[PDB]
């Protein structure tokens, strides 16, 4: 029944939806994205190597 | 129970019933639909329960940081010569240390 | 001097019941936190089972 | 002398305050900000890759 | 005991129906609107103040 807890619900509520979207990846997978780009940097500097000499 | 038996009768006879009406290659499928809504909701809900484990963190975390600065607030008033204010700040302190034992517990 | 023997024991009395309703805020999210696990666990071994015809 | 020494201490309360209101609108528009950005990417991976027709 | 405990269910139900009427978008932008209107409120309090101190 005021501005301060209504700030706290709706503060809650996007860290809730923050939280829900964490969740969300692991439920559909995680990661594909950074085992890719490991190797993309992997191969950016040995490239980077190669191109150079 | 004569009666019962003929109530048997009445579920058997719908069971028969309904057996003409599975058609194969649609309830089948169906079956299939069924599963996959079951499933997405199920997900969905074990991933709300898993954000909580994420919730606790950010509580119990917060709690501690309170807690260290109530701490630092307190050496100031003892050099200054304020005991109720350093008092007052150890008081505030372990109130949030033992809710982030709690939290912990819980985590 | 009465006024204020009444002060501090209405005040002692009401930072005590701060701290019980601070409780209890902090109870319920450890509460809500169950409810919500104990529900996915049994829709777990209803879905991975086959109870019911 | 009498006001001097309390409207000293009402101004420190309105400022207080508004460094509380200020803080609430800063936090306000980050907060619709991420909220948009998780509700959206939610979206994205229930229908993009989600399951369950 | 129980007119009072039906009454937190009913409290309890209405909580939810309005928790669920709340989308943070709109609420949260309509709290910082309260505390703005609040606010000027309070400045025309502290104009008067320093005025009649003037």
Same mark, same amino acid.
């Given at each position: 029944?005021?501005?301060?807890? #209504?700030?706290?619900?709706? *503060? @809650?509520?996007?860290?809730?939806? !923050? %939280?829900? /979207?964490?969740?969300?990846? =692991? &439920? #559909?997978?995680?990661?594909? *994205? @950074?085992?890719?780009?490991?190797? !993309? %940097?992997? /191969?950016?500097?040995?490239? =980077? &190597? #190669?191109?150079?000499? | 129970?004569?009666?019962?038996?003929?109530?048997?009768?009445?579920?058997?006879?719908?069971?028969?019933?309904?057996?003409?009406?599975?058609?194969?290659?649609?309830?089948?499928?169906?079956?299939?639909?069924?599963?996959?809504?079951?499933?997405?909701?199920?997900?969905?809900?074990?991933?709300?329960?898993?954000?909580?484990?994420?919730?606790?963190?950010?509580?119990?975390?917060?709690?501690?940081?309170?807690?260290?600065?109530?701490?630092?607030?307190?050496?100031?008033?003892?050099?200054?010569?304020?005991?109720?204010?350093?008092?007052?700040?150890?008081?505030?302190?372990?109130?949030?240390?033992?809710?982030?034992?709690?939290?912990?517990?819980?985590? | 001097?009465?006024?204020?023997?009444?002060?501090?024991?209405?005040?002692?009395?009401?930072?005590?019941?701060?701290?019980?309703?601070?409780?209890?805020?902090?109870?319920?999210?450890?509460?809500?936190?169950?409810?919500?696990?104990?529900?996915?666990?049994?829709?777990?071994?209803?879905?991975?089972?086959?109870?019911?015809?």
């Amino acid at each position: 029944s005021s501005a301060t807890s #209504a700030f706290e619900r709706m *503060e @809650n509520k996007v860290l809730d939806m !923050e %939280a829900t /979207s964490q969740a969300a990846g =692991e &439920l #559909a997978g995680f990661g594909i *994205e @950074n085992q890719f780009a490991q190797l !993309e %940097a992997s /191969s950016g500097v040995e490239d =980077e &190597l #190669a191109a150079l000499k | 129970a004569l009666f019962d038996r003929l109530g048997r009768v009445v579920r058997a006879n719908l069971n028969d019933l309904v057996s003409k009406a599975e058609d194969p290659e649609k309830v089948l499928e169906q079956a299939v639909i069924d599963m996959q809504e079951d499933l997405v909701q199920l997900r969905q809900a074990v991933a709300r329960t898993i954000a909580e484990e994420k919730r606790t963190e950010q509580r119990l975390n917060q709690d501690t940081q309170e807690a260290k600065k109530w701490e630092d607030r307190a050496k100031l008033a003892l050099t200054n010569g304020e005991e109720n204010l350093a008092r007052e700040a150890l008081a505030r302190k372990k109130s949030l240390t033992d809710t982030a034992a709690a939290y912990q517990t819980q985590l | 001097a009465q006024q204020r023997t009444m002060s501090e024991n209405l005040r002692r009395n009401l930072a005590a019941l701060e701290a019980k309703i601070s409780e209890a805020k902090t109870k319920k999210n450890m509460l809500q936190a169950r409810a919500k696990a104990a529900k996915a666990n049994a829709e777990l071994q209803q879905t991975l089972g086959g109870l019911g015809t």
